[PDB]
């Protein structure tokens, strides 16, 4: 969309691969305020709003928090306090044509500066001076929208640049889009520290024959102690038992008699620690 008529999209209820865009280096400008891309992946957000518009390379400077520009004032305004990522990649190859693409328009002059995150579609002849425009072309009366030349050989400052700005909104209580979670490999038959769907624990995982229900994730025995969990990847049920623990007792015939001692590990099969079970 044109810069004055910037197009906003709403993205939610999904997993957002912020790393993929961050890892890609094609984009000329990646200015993120109040958030880091690596932090974005772990973070959770209620709703992102992506604004897509084509502007000159010079005007890429204007579209930033705390930046004053004619394009910023009359086309798209960015709040200073706002936290988001501004992404700009050169579009001179595709947008530009030998004749020149003048379809992209921008508001040269407007009666008032646009409020933050506000889009104006008004097409009325701007009125300069005391004399009224009357909606007709005249001296001091000009159409606000102005075309972009966007010639193929145009200077890089004037070259068309496609800019998308991401607006992370945490106002709404659930972080529906939020972000992705990369899962480590599964290991069983060894006492490990596990974190399943935010449920943390320590123990040894093993195959289980008990049958859950399709909607049912984990289980607890009497006294509300976890006994089995479903791993979300392969829809399998795994039994959880705490790894061996117990007391160690020393059997001695008395220092007065001898120096040798024996060690008893209580309730711990010691195949994994003259051994008698």
């Amino acid at each position, epitope marked *: 969309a044109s810069v004055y008529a910037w197009n906003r999209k709403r993205i939610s209820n999904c997993v957002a691969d912020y790393s993929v865009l961050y890892n890609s*280096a094609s984009f000329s400008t990646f*200015k993120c305020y*109040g*958030v880091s*891309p690596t*932090k974005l992946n772990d973070l959770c957000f209620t709703n992102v709003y992506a604004d897509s518009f084509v502007i000159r390379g010079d005007e*890429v*400077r204007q579209i930033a928090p705390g930046q004053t520009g004619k394009i910023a004032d009359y086309n798209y305004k960015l709040p200073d306090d706002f936290t988001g990522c501004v992404i700009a990649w050169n579009s001179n190859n595709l947008d530009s044509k030998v004749g020149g693409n003048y379809n992209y328009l921008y508001r040269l002059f407007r009666k008032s500066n646009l409020k933050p995150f506000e889009r104006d579609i008004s097409t009325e002849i701007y009125q300069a001076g005391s004399t009224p425009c009357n909606g007709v072309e005249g001296f001091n009366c000009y159409f606000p929208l102005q075309s972009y030349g966007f010639q193929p050989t145009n200077g890089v*400052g004037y070259q068309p640049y496609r800019v998308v700005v991401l607006s992370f909104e945490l106002l709404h209580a659930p972080a529906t889009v939020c972000g992705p979670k990369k899962s480590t490999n599964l290991v069983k038959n060894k006492c490990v520290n596990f974190n399943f769907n935010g449920l943390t624990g320590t123990g040894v995982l093993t195959e289980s024959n008990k049958k859950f229900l399709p909607f049912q994730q984990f289980g607890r025995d009497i006294a509300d102690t976890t006994d089995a969990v479903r791993d979300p990847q392969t829809l399998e049920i795994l039994d959880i038992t705490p790894c061996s623990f117990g007391g160690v007792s020393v059997i001695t015939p008395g220092t007065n008699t001898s120096n040798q001692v024996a060690v008893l590990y209580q309730d711990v099969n010691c195949t994994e620690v003259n051994v008698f079970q």
Partner: nanobody
Amino acid sequence: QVQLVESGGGLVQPGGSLRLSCAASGFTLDDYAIGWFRQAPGKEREGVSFITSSDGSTYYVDSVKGRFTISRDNAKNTVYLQMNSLTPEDTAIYYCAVGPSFSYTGSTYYRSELPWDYDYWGQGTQVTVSS
């Protein structure tokens, strides 16, 4: 005021290693974004490498990926860009640029090869690579 001084440069052999030091006066190096830009003759300057974040995370342009490494020393208030495998295409004048300060802007991550984004510009030093 902010003043940037560029040191290094000059003619080097193909594949040579050369380091450019950007001296910083009047501002803290860590807080402000640091961008090394290359301007070819007759062409607009473009940023080869950037210090994206205050903690020191860095991004490198595909052309200079691996070949160019940028390091910031706060104690000595200087940013050094090390160039390796230098080539005649690489030959151009290199400018040290100061981006907006991370703390004031609130920008954790900031990388921009477009020159207008960086508020302050160093004079720059010519780096030439020839057989």
